[PDB]
Amino acid sequence: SMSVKKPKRDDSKDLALCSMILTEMETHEDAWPFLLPVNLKLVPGYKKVIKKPMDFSTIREKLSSGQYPNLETFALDVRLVFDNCETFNEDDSDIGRAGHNMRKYFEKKWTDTFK
């Protein structure tokens, strides 16, 4: 509350660490569905069904240009990429499997880096 602060967690390496995690996701072999925005002219249903499209390149731009206020807002966008995938793709599809694999990969790196 006013003049009463919890001890200061060092957040000064978070930008760099999130960049590193993002790099590891960009270079995973199953990142291909997620590297670029879905082409909303060429994929029927995508625009209407997926209210908040997200992809790795868009996340990379936001990170590089100070559009994440903190590491939680970063993790929200990465989870959004995998939540969207689950919404639009059957679990038993190559894309659907890719998404489950990537989410598992992300969450481990996130826990190990910050928890």
UniProtKB/Swiss-Prot annotation:
Cellular compartments annotated: Nucleus
Domain Bromo per the UniProt entry, residue ranges: 9-113
Tissue/organ expression: Expressed at varying levels in several tissues, whereas a smaller transcript was expressed specifically in testis.
Superkingdom of origin organism: Eukaryota
Subunit structure comment from the entry: Component of the BRF-1 ISWI chromatin remodeling complex, at least composed of SMARCA1 and BAZ2B, which regulates the spacing of histone octamers on the DNA template to facilitate access to DNA. Within the BRF-1 ISWI chromatin remodeling complex interacts with SMARCA1; the interaction is direct. Component of the BRF-5 ISWI chromatin remodeling complex, at least composed of SMARCA5/SNF2H and BAZ2B, which regulates the spacing of histone octamers on the DNA template to facilitate access to DNA.
Chain's role: Regulatory subunit of the ATP-dependent BRF-1 and BRF-5 ISWI chromatin remodeling complexes, which form ordered nucleosome arrays on chromatin and facilitate access to DNA during DNA-templated processes such as DNA replication, transcription, and repair. Both complexes regulate the spacing of nucleosomes along the chromatin and have the ability to slide mononucleosomes to the center of a DNA template. The BRF-1 ISWI chromatin remodeling complex has a lower ATP hydrolysis rate than the BRF-5 ISWI chromatin remodeling complex.
Family to which the UniProt record says this protein belongs: Belongs to the WAL family.
Name assigned to this protein: Bromodomain adjacent to zinc finger domain protein 2B
Organism: Homo sapiens
Upper taxonomic lineage: Eukaryota, Metazoa, Chordata, Craniata, Vertebrata
